[PDB]
Amino acid sequence: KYYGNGVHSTKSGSSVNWGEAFSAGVHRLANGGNGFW
């Protein structure tokens, strides 16, 4: 499930929600993985 299942209200930030989801996960890999590189 990706780019579709949004916890927050899409009304407020539909496009911002999708990106926010993935962006949030980056924090996990940022501690031990790729992160943003």
Side-chain angles (χ1 to χ4, degrees):
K1 206 77 189 157
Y2 51 87
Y3 211 136
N5 165 45
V7 185
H8 305 92
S9 40
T10 53
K11 209 278 207 88
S12 208
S14 199
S15 197
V16 183
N17 169 274
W18 314 133
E20 271 277 3
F22 306 118
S23 186
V26 179
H27 304 148
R28 211 75 206 162
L29 308 97
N31 306 125
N34 46 83
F36 219 73
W37 47 276

